[PDB]
Design a protein around this ligand. Structure first.
Ligand code: AGS
Ligand code: AGS
Ligand code: AGS
Ligand code: AGS
Lengths: 718, 5, 238, 310
């Protein structure tokens, strides 16, 4: 009817139709608007706040209080209209047309009989509108009349838009009143999600456990820093409810992945078998065994779909009959009896049968962690699954097999890492803090310091860890701490402050952590680094909240901090540690603990004492014995096969042939390096020169064995 | 001792 | 027949024509978009990731699953449109033409009788479009709608473009959902390249030995660090 | 406030008697009009609670952890790190925002401003800080005036800890007598004389109260461990696992891992790396229902044991 009503949209009609039904109470914020609308002078509040905190939902909640009458009667009966710029700026084609568009809008808003309070979505867009070459801005037209009280206006801008666009025109600011929308303070956000449950249960049809509602608050808010609180806490339930519809209306996820893969592996059988028999025989026979055994995993998977399908329907059968007969039979409680025989016969099974079916689900969720089949209930494991996917942990490691791989870590580490078993328990237990969820918030997991003499495998514990915890080399965010010899190289960590070159990118270390928040961070050599770099990390060990060029908080929760550094080259004794390590004694136990107590005292001198207490476990690696180095050399030959997979030359070695490799180049003062130099510069040459001259066909197995007579190594070729 | 055996 | 087909090129006609024929999809990746394409509010995932790591490949793999039917029964029949920024600049004759250009697009997006779903190639763009002297910010024209589920939309940008431009707004960012595309972890790339033999054999007449394929991957893996992985293994084979 | 802080932290009651009294000026409104309420400079050994006095003020004066403005001074060791505070001057990159600090103070004009590790900074950031402690009158890039009135400013630094009269007062002060207490006045005066030589003596003019933290006594640290177990259900509230601990088992935690020089961070790690990890590995294997009454008790046989009930 009215001239502004076709511009934008009428917000009041959508409350009447129920599109905008309901808001949670932010009543101190809501009444502050109503008082600003009743002022004598300006009557134009602006909802300044963070982008996610629901600034429009106050106004979407304010219209619901107008039509339902929860306002004073001086504001009773006004209608609220939004103004999108998609409809507002369409008439700016001709030169004197947009001002006529502006003129009739003012002529309706100045009317008192026309009871309209106006709303705009973002005011900072409205400043740059209608700027023809002969015409003024739309905001400058409003400036003489927004000072006058008859034009009621409500608007909302974010803080970064308000400091850049409104403050550039300071005269446009004084027509408006700030009302600060505040972040909703997590303990109130739990009550917001509980208010919204019935709206999601109608749109999704999926039961939502209150366990997930707290998990949608504490896990969303404290662990993610951008996109302020209710844009996080509502978002995961928005993904939790969307996650289960696809597993119910479609198949569950495990069957969906395996059916696609077997169709792809069968396509690879068509590629390899048609080719000539060669080196690809080994991969073809690998894939045929992979094809059958994954296909046989299906037969128990469908069994699980049917059995949990029987568990789901049998719980669904009692929710239709006895759950409704429990509730509707509330009539005539007063005198026509509410507790006689048969009224409770069925109420008795409603605790027996329903809770037994409940415990079969809960035991199935902890067994099949995130991919439980035929489950109508949201759980914490579903909320953590979405958190773990969008945060960026790789798809096949340590969390998707929840609470099962944390026990197997210490067994798996030993093969990769034989020696120094005491420190590996601390690395295993730090992941046990991570996998259970029990840890200190805003404290990084596992701030280990790895002291020792060179070549005892201090960084090996870390290289193999990213392969083990994450199955990805890229998650090892190594930084070369030996680069930071200069005092002025500190800005490689946090980045360059504003007004200097390279501000648009952040710090080179911190830009990777935003990309990979679940990562095992290295610091290669704190021995050879300037003390000013230690001032900046000091932050990262006590808190995760290191700051950037833009002061964005970074999540160093769920980040294992391995710090290898030396502090040796004297002080670790040449005759009481290196040469005497072979003779297994309890005399180890007053010499290793003796030299360790000086090393923590050494950290008080070269590092700061603030590192001595914030580091969780200062591991000191024992120098290598013969029995450990006998298996470290055995590892190399296991790694030598990986370099020779492209040429299909399997390499094996006898234990007597390992010992001659040890006896020729055993130096504990270095440890594990000259043995590898003796492997890679001597034994590896005839692995090499016997290929150039044709002593090695591409399918030849090698078994190195010490002669123990003729004194020279023999090379067994088949 | 290269032995092809 | 669509008005939006004039400006955004239709991805759905390519799979019926056979412009793309069979995609080695990433199974845990593509279904996250389908779960984001049904949503009470947001309905707008974005494929944040790397320059050479298959962003289009996921959405070409999505249309291959929609047109054949592998998606849930709600999402069946939905049309996917790749927008052309060469065709957005054709408007703006003097002033107000782009608002006629914008309003006709959003009206078809509001109709559920229309099955149309936008696919922006790069939401790195859309911030500079339509910003004349009287301009009113084409991306900010989408802001009153994207909070509601009226527009289904897919995006795909790099992390560097996500940091330099999308986080600068901080209110345009919150509606989109980061779906992190990951480099494909070499063992899968051998399974990628073996699924790409049949097209490469017919296009060249040249047989490719499978021993060269693992040699095409492993030489590309460590020995070239930049230009993330699926650009390397596809090109060094090609 | 004086009763609330003593329940939350077991600190020096001298610093709290000065800190809570400065807050009294905010409620009465009789205060310095253009000087910030209660400037402080905390000192002491590492590991004692210099920051959590300033952290619980976000919890008690405002009940909001984000209202604390934790400015990490340790990232300001480079001399050209001034431009994070006042922002970049015009004609350069980053002129749109006012600065990393000043945009935050304009967003929340009522906050406890925290400067952790004040020592770990170049002397140029000290130059701008003289403006903030003396006046509210720091200016932005666009010369917006700021009010650091109604904002408590709490800076902490590690200086001392070699001057702080080592092991004599660390290892031997297991009880607080007037005989030990006469040393602390003699050390505190040398800390102020050390503050003149490094922290540019005019800083001492603006600072309203230079508190100095004592190292933790065994009777002092015994109450802190009881607070950690009260905070231990706060990470277990989503799991509903109540964890009560007897006092004798708390004495076993202290006597095995007491380090008075380190501020009893080794006591806190010994909780998180032994008794918390056994709580963590017992949850992996199927020994813990989500509802379990847990009562840690020491059986006086050189072994701690965890009593469980459903
Ligand atoms: N108290 C609340 N009750 C109900 N829904 C809420 C509440 N707070 C936030 N939301 C939801 O979270 C979103 C908040 O919207 P806003 O923060 O206003 O974003 P916006 O509407 O796009 O305006 P901007 O982007 O902030 S300028 C909406 O999708 C709401 O449904
Ligand atoms: N415990 C171990 N387990 C497995 N391999 C080991 C072990 N100790 C040493 N190695 C091997 O010996 C070498 C150890 O490399 P690292 O010592 O970790 O490099 P690094 O840590 O920087 O050395 P330093 O001590 O800093 S000079 C690698 O070749 C490892 O494979
Ligand atoms: N899993 C896959 N299946 C099929 N083809 C693939 C796959 N991964 C990569 N490709 C091919 O490799 C190319 C990589 O494309 P993208 O990395 O998406 O580059 P783009 O499509 O130009 O988007 P950008 O540049 O990364 S933002 C595509 O053209 C695909 O044909
Ligand atoms: N007097 C105290 N009252 C309560 N808790 C304390 C006290 N002293 C230490 N703590 C605890 O010990 C730790 C002290 O943290 P803080 O020392 O304040 O951090 P920090 O101040 O940066 O440390 P430094 O000295 O700068 S290395 C926290 O876990 C506190 O809870």
């Amino acid at each position: 009817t009215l001239y502004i009503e076709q511009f934008g949209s009428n917000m009041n009609e959508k409350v009447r139709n129920g599109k905008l039904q309901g808001i949670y109470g932010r009543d101190e914020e809501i009444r502050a608007i109503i008082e600003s609308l009743l002022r004598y002078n300006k009557n134009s509040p602006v909802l300044v706040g963070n982008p996610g905190t629901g600034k429009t939902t106050i106004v979407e909640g304010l219209v619901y209080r107008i039509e339902k009458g929860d306002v004073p009667k001086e504001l009773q009966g006004y209608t609220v209209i939004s103004l999108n710029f998609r409809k507002f700026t369409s008439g700016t084609s001709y030169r004197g047309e947009f001002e006529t568009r502006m003129k009739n809008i003012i002529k309706e808003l100045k009317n008192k009989k026309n009871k309209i309070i106006l709303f705009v979505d973002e005011i900072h867009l409205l400043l740059g509108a209608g700027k023809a070459e002969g015409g003024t801005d739309a905001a400058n037209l409003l400036k003489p009349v927004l000072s006058k009280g008859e034009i009621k206006l409500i608007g909302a801008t974010t803080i970064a838009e308000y400091r850049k666009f409104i403050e550039s025109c300071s005269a446009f600011e004084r027509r408006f009143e700030k009302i600060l929308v505040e972040p909703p303070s997590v303990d109130m956000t739990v009550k917001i999600l509980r208010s919204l449950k019935s709206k999601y249960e109608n749109f999704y049809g999926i039961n939502i456990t209150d366990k997930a509602l707290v998990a949608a608050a504490k896990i969303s808010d404290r662990f993610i820093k951008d996109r302020y609180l209710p844009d996080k806490a509502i978002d995961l339930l928005n993904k939790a409810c969307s996650f289960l519809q696809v597993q119910l209306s479609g198949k569950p996820r495990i069957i969906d992945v395996t059916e696609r893969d077997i169709e792809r592996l069968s396509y690879e059988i068509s590629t390899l078998e048609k080719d000539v028999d060669k080196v690809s025989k080994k991969k073809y026979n690998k894939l045929i065994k992979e094809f059958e055994e994954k296909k046989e995993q299906l037969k128990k998977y469908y069994e699980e779909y049917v059995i949990t399908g029987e568990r789901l329907k049998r719980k669904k059968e009692i929710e239709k009959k006895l759950n409704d007969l429990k509730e509707l039979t509330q009539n005539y409680v007063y005198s026509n009896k509410e507790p006689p025989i048969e009224l409770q016969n069925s109420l008795k099974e409603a605790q027996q049968k329903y809770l037994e079916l409940y415990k079969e689900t809960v035991a199935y969720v902890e067994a099949k962690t995130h991919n439980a089949m035929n489950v109508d209930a949201v759980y914490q494991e579903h909320v953590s699954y979405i958190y773990l996917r969008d945060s960026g942990m790789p798809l096949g490691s340590l969390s998707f097999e929840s609470s099962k791989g944390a026990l197997k870590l210490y067994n798996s580490l030993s093969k990769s890492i034989i020696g120094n078993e005491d420190i590996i328990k601390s690395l295993s237990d730090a992941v046990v803090k991570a996998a259970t969820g029990m840890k200190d918030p805003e404290k990084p997991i596992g701030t280990f310091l790895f002291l020792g003499p060179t070549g005892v495998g201090k960084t090996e514990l870390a290289k193999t860890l990213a392969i083990e915890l994450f199955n990805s080399k890229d998650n090892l965010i190594r930084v070369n701490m030996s680069e930071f010899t200069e005092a002025h190289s500190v800005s490689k960590i946090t980045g360059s402050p504003p007004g200097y070159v390279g501000f648009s990118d952040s710090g080179q270390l911190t830009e990777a952590v935003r990309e990979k928040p679940h990562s095992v961070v290295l610091f290669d050599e704190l021995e050879k680094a300037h003390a000013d770099v230690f001032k900046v990390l000091l932050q990262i060990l006590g808190d995760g909240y290191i700051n950037d060029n833009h002061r964005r908080n970074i999540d160093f929760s769920n980040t294992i901090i391995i710090m290898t550094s030396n502090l040796g080259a004297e002080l670790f004794k040449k005759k009481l540690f290196f040469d005497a390590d072979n003779s297994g004694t309890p005399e180890y136990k007053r010499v290793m603990e003796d030299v360790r107590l000086s090393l923590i005292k050494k950290c008080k001198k070269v590092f700061k004492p603030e590192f001595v207490n914030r580091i969780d476990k200062i591991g000191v690696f024992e120098p290598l014995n013969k029995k450990n180095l006998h298996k470290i050399v055995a590892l190399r030959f296991k790694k030598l096969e990986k370099r020779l997979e492209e040429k299909n030359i399997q390499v094996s070695v006898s234990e007597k042939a390992i010992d001659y490799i040890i006896d020729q180049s055993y130096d504990p003062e270095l440890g594990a390096r000259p043995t590898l130099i003796f492997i890679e510069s001597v034994i590896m040459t005839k692995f090499a020169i016997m290929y150039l001259k044709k002593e090695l066909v591409d399918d030849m197995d090698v078994f190195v064995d010490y002669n123990s007579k003729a004194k020279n190594l023999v090379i067994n070729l088949s | 001792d290269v032995d092809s055996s």
